[PDB]
Every structure is written in structure tokens, then in C-alpha cells.
């Protein structure tokens, strides 16, 4: 009972810590992903416009 309360707190906090770690990792990968797409878009734009005006 005292041991039940300890377990439930640990189970609840394990789940919470995991959801945060995972969210932080998704956030970081996402940032990178946006950085890559931004760069790609910029290149397409530059050389598409250069082409069209050629």
C-alpha cells in the first residue's frame, strides 16, 4: 500500500520523463529537417528564376 503508492508514482513519472525526452528529440530532428528543406527551396528558387530569365 505504501509500496503501491511508490510504484504508481514511479510509473507515472517514468511515462512523463519518456514523453519529454522523446518530444525533445523530435523537436531537434524537426529543426534540422526544416533547415534542410529551407536550403533546398532556396536553391530551386534561385536557379529556376535564373533559368526562366535566360
Amino acid at each position: 500500500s505504501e509500496a503501491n503508492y511508490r510504484k504508481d508514482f514511479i510509473d507515472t513519472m517514468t511515462r512523463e520523463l519518456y514523453d519529454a525526452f522523446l518530444h525533445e528529440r523530435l523537436y531537434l530532428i524537426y529543426m534540422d529537417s526544416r533547415a534542410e528543406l529551407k536550403r533546398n527551396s532556396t536553391l530551386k528558387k534561385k536557379f529556376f528564376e535564373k533559368w526562366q530569365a535566360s
Binding site: R39, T42, F47
Partner: protein, 153 residues
């Protein structure tokens, strides 16, 4: 050094710098922390090691805040943009047009890029962009034909 840089940057290059900073200025406060700066530079095609990023912040850190101001980011990235290898740029752009990897930019590809950039163009005038620069007569544009377009400047 403001002035000597933005006379030799193209307007599209100045937008690129501004847009890359804004994207990761979550604060909208004109400052970026370390991870934000890292990705902002990556948005411009620059991969720096930890040591150089830290030293860049420390160099320009007018306020001990460990952040980087938009105006300093503009100066540092402006110089690096100017030192880009134009030929390496053209080649990456090529792989990006040829997104099905046939080794040639077809009308399918070019029309897809146009639609991505929100560019509103006739089918007939997309054909003309190829027709006007197709040195093979093969109806499509290979890396060389494309490098030739972009190198004319």
C-alpha cells in the same frame, strides 16, 4: 562591416539570410541561442563544428547573454555566402530538380518545381525553357546542359 557586404550581396541572398534567421527565432526577438544558430546556418548550407559556433557567439556577444544578434549573423553569413562555390551550388540544384533521379530534368520535373515555387506558367512556356537550352535534341536537360544555363550568368 556594414555596407561593403550588402552592395555585393544580391537581394535574393539578403532575403535568404533574413528568412533563415526568422525561421528559428522562436522568440521573434532578433536573437538566437546555440542550437538555433546551428540550424540557421544549416539552413544556408553551412555546417560548422561546435568549437567554431561557440567562438562565433563569444566573438560577437555584446551583452554576455550567449546569444547571436540578427545584425551579426547577417555579417558573418554574408561573407560565407559570398565565398560559396558557384559550381557546387549549381550541381546541388540539379539533383533537386531531377528528383526522380533519371540524370535529366524533364518537363515533369520542371513543372513540379514551378508548382512548388508557386510559379504560374503555361505548359508551352515550360517546354520553351527546355527547348531553348536542349543541346542534345533529346527533349530534356542533363547536368552539363544545366550547368551551361547557370554558368552564362
Amino acid at each position: 562591416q556594414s555596407g561593403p557586404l550588402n552592395s555585393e550581396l544580391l537581394e535574393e541572398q539578403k532575403q535568404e539570410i533574413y528568412e533563415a534567421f526568422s525561421l528559428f527565432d522562436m522568440n521573434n526577438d532578433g536573437f538566437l541561442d546555440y542550437h538555433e544558430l546551428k540550424v540557421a546556418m544549416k539552413a544556408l548550407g553551412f555546417e560548422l563544428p561546435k568549437r567554431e559556433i561557440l567562438d562565433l557567439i563569444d566573438e560577437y556577444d555584446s551583452e554576455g547573454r550567449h546569444l547571436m544578434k540578427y545584425d551579426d549573423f547577417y555579417i558573418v553569413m554574408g561573407e560565407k555566402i559570398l565565398k560559396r562555390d558557384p559550381l557546387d551550388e549549381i550541381k546541388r540544384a540539379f539533383q533537386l530538380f531531377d528528383d526522380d533521379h533519371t540524370g535529366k530534368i524533364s518537363i515533369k520535373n520542371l513543372r513540379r518545381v514551378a508548382k512548388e515555387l508557386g510559379e504560374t506558367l503555361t505548359d508551352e512556356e515550360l517546354r520553351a525553357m527546355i527547348e531553348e537550352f536542349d543541346l542534345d535534341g533529346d527533349g530534356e536537360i542533363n547536368e552539363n546542359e544545366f550547368i551551361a544555363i547557370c554558368t552564362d550568368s
